[PDB]
Amino acid sequence: MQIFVKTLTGKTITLEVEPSDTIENVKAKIQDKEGIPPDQQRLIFAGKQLEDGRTLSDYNIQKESTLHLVLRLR
């Protein structure tokens, strides 16, 4: 329902979502909260990268979860 996203800076930011919110949605949630486009972000959860066609319940994360926002890739 409402989740956390921790950056490497330790800047935790909290979002209100829905179990049937697509992962492409959370990134736009983040866009509205941080002014970072979704194409310039990558979310991982408990090791695993999250892909754009899936939902939080399909990754099995609800209530007080932390997603790591990753803002450097190669």
Partner: protein, 151 residues
């Protein structure tokens, strides 16, 4: 099935007007499978080699990207241990205005322009970035070792 026209016509256009340095044929059985030989580009550590690939059209093809696998052993930092290549699009995904010929061309280009700052095989990328000249030396050795005498 074996249609649509799109796959049919792409497969004709590939056999009719092929990509210089690239041969790409359908498999007799399975029209969505493709045997590909790409020549080592001139002015590259793979010059004078021939490299076998398989290209598969997934069953959603026109909008899923085709899967590509190097069969031939190659010393390149954008091809992993299992001959997989990064087909990733930059701040975008695969559109259907991208066809098989674009991916074939793209692999070709990648052979000329090895990118170690986007590694898929870390040991070789890591050696490509510090001892480039020793990387390339081994690259030429491998193409002699695995990519010459292949037809």
């Amino acid at each position: 099935a074996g249609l649509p026209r799109r796959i049919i016509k792409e497969t004709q256009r590939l056999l009719a007007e092929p990509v210089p340095g690239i041969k790409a044929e359908p498999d007799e059985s399975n029209a969505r499978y493709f045997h590909v030989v790409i020549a080592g580009p001139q002015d590259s550590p793979f010059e004078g080699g021939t490299f076998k690939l398989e290209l598969f059209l997934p069953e959603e093809y026109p909008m899923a990207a085709p899967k590509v696998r190097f069969m031939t052993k190659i010393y390149h930092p954008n091809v992993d241990k299992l001959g997989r290549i990064c087909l990733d699009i930059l701040k975008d995904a695969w559109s259907p205005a991208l066809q098989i010929r674009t991916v074939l061309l793209s692999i070709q280009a990648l052979l000329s322009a090895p990118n170690p700052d986007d590694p898929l095989a870390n040991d070789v990328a890591e050696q490509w970035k510090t001892n480039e000249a020793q990387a390339i030396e081994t690259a030429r050795a491998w193409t002699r070792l695995y990519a010459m005498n292949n037809i």
